[model samples]
Target: GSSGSSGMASDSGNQGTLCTLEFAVQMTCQSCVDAVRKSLQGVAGVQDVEVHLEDQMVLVHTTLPSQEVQALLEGTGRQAVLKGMGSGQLQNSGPSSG
Candidate 1:
């Protein structure tokens, strides 16, 4: 038998399920929205970001857990509350599929 070629693992792939998480952010102005957007987009797992200034709600389409996203949002120094979560579309650009 000859040497076999096996796939290598550089980083562990968890393939966490993608979900649309809704959060009520206490954003008073555009600056708060910008900060929230910037903070969430910095993460690799974040797929989409929807900031509603009027409703003060942020919908994040990401593969990361709700708690993680909440923490990231709150990291901006603005209060964030998770309101809902649902399965996201699979047809969208993929991420971390092992």
Candidate 2:
């Protein structure tokens, strides 16, 4: 369950993109969060990576295509719950389960 705006002609003024990916990893502590963050941060076009322990999810912001994100996640030994798709615009009123 991921989505993002399409039709952007270029990266400029794109504000990047936001997508949520859920992963069932052994992230039970801050160090785990840091490890995950570090792993994802190395990916090209990944502007930011935030791992939320409370939800066992990772929120990724990037200008790269979704496939690249998937590849990076795989390289880190974690799987992207959704591949080849961007998580749709986030709703302000609720939690994301995917």
Per-model lDDT:
0.86, 0.63
The TM-score that candidate 2 achieves is 0.51
Residue 50 CA error for candidate 2 (Å)?
1.6
Best by lDDT: 1
| lDDT of candidate 1 over 2-79, digit per residue (tens) | 787788779867676877899999988788988999998757888899999989899999988788888888889998
User: Model 2, 1-98: lDDT tens per residue?
Assistant: 99888675655553555554444444667876776788776666676776767767776777666566666666665555642244555548777799
Weakest 10 consecutive residues of candidate 1 by summed lDDT: 85-94
Off by over 4 Å in 1: 1-15, 87-98
Candidate 2 residue spans exceeding 4 A from truth: 1-31, 83-98
Pairs clashing in candidate 2? 2-86, 2-87, 2-88, 3-86, 3-87, 3-88
In model 2, state the lDDT of residue 62.
72
